[PDB]
Amino acid sequence: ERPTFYRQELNKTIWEVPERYQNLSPVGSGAGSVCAAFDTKTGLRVAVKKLSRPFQSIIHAKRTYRELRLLKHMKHENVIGLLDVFTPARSLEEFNDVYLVTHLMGADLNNQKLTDDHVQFLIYQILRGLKYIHSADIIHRDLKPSNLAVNEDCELKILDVATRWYRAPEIMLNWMHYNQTVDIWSVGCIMAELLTGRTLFPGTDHIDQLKLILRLVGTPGAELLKKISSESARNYIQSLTQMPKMNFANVFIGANPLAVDLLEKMLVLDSDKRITAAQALAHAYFAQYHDPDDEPVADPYDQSSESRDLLIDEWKSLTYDEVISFVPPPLD
Numbered sequence: 643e644r645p646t647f648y649r650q651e652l653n654k655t656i657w658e659v660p661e662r663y664q665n666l667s668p669v670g671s672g673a674g675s676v677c678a679a680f681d682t683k684t685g686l687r688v689a690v691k692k693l694s695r696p697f698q699s700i701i702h703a704k705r706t707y708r709e710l711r712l713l714k715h716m717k718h719e720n721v722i723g724l725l726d727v728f729t730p731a732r733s734l735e736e737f738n739d740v741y742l743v744t745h746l747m748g749a750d751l752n753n754q755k756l757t758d759d760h761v762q763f764l765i766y767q768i769l770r771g772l773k774y775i776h777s778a779d780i781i782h783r784d785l786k787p788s789n790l791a792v793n794e795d796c797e798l799k800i801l802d803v804a805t806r807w808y809r810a811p812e813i814m815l816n817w818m819h820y821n822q823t824v825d826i827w828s829v830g831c832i833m834a835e836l837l838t839g840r841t842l843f844p845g846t847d848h849i850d851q852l853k854l855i856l857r858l859v860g861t862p863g864a865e866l867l868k869k870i871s872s873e874s875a876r877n878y879i880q881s882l883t884q885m886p887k888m889n890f891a892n893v894f895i896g897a898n899p900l901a902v903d904l905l906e907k908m909l910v911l912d913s914d915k916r917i918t919a920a921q922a923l924a925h926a927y928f929a930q931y932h933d934p935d936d937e938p939v940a941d942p943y944d945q946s947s948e949s950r951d952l953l954i955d956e957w958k959s960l961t962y963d964e965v966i967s968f969v970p971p972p973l974d
């Protein structure tokens with residue numbers, strides 16, 4: 643049955659939401675607008691995002707669909723999920739607005755070294771979430787402290803200048819064919835910063851970022867240089883003065899040797915040689931948290947919906963179908 647909706651003017655528009663969602667109050671970007679609310683059915687504080695111009699163009703429509711589909715797929719403790727999605731529309735013909743409801747997250751990992759035991763717990767949770775995302779054949783591509791939410795029990799969820807500080811070197815070289823370990827590079831950068839209280843590679847601009855990375859991990863070795871299809875890349879690298887990888891033990895002074903060992907395995911230039919999320923969860927650094935019985939994988943996720951060129955009304959109809967078919971997660 644259809645919930646009774648009410649209407650209220652918020653962020654220059656009339657929002658129309660199920661009455662279960664009370665005390666709406668703005669907090670949000672625009673890069674759709676977000677309101678905080680209290681969900682009375684579940685007892686939870688939530689974020690309610692009214693999408694802005696979701697079907698204004700083919701590009702907007704395809705974006706909306708892909709975003710909804712992703713959020714509907716993600717069902718893991720360490721990944722943001724969808725609590726609800728709704729529209730006031732009673733039919734496709736009347737369908738214009740989409741609203742997404744998620745847990746209201748109070749803090750992120752930006753929000754001043756952490757202790758080694760806390761770094762262990764936070765990075766464990768990131769990697770547990772990443773194992774799940776990667777198992778769906780999804781690459782996050784923009785892992786950074788602001789995309790990591792934590793609650794007051796230090797339970798963590800991976801979220802949905804934009805800073806370059808956490809970005810894998812191959813993304814900044816426009817390499818394409820990205821591996822999932824682009825995300826492992828980011829996790830390394832985050833872990834280093836939690837341990838030291840300092841940004842590992844605080845690049846001022848695009849080339850400076852690359853310069854800082856090369857300073858720590860050294861210039862490419864022969865095995866990596868063999869895999870560079872680009873003639874221009876190859877000839878530039880060969881001309882750099884050969885520098886060895888720095889000693890992470892004497893870069894992360896005071897740090898748990900198990901942590902340094904893990905960082906050495908994450909922050910490798912060659913993406914094929916970086917540790918995977920599932921391998922990292924088995925690393926002795928996480929001995930106190932690691933449990934193979936509860937590090938679950940995802941169902942396969944279909945991203946083909948993505949190479950396709952469809953009409954606006956087709957993307958719109960497909961999005962409508964996803965809104966109607968939505969099943970809320972268990973009351974928990």
Ligand SMILES: CCCCCCCCO[C@@H]1O[C@H](CO)[C@@H](O)[C@H](O)[C@H]1O
Pocket residue numbers: 811812817818819820821852862866869879911912913914
């Ligand atoms: C001057 C800085 C050079 C940075 C080298 C980064 C190499 C990243 O690693 C590479 O990434 C690709 C994308 O997955 C793969 O196709 C390769 O097999 C791999 O070597």
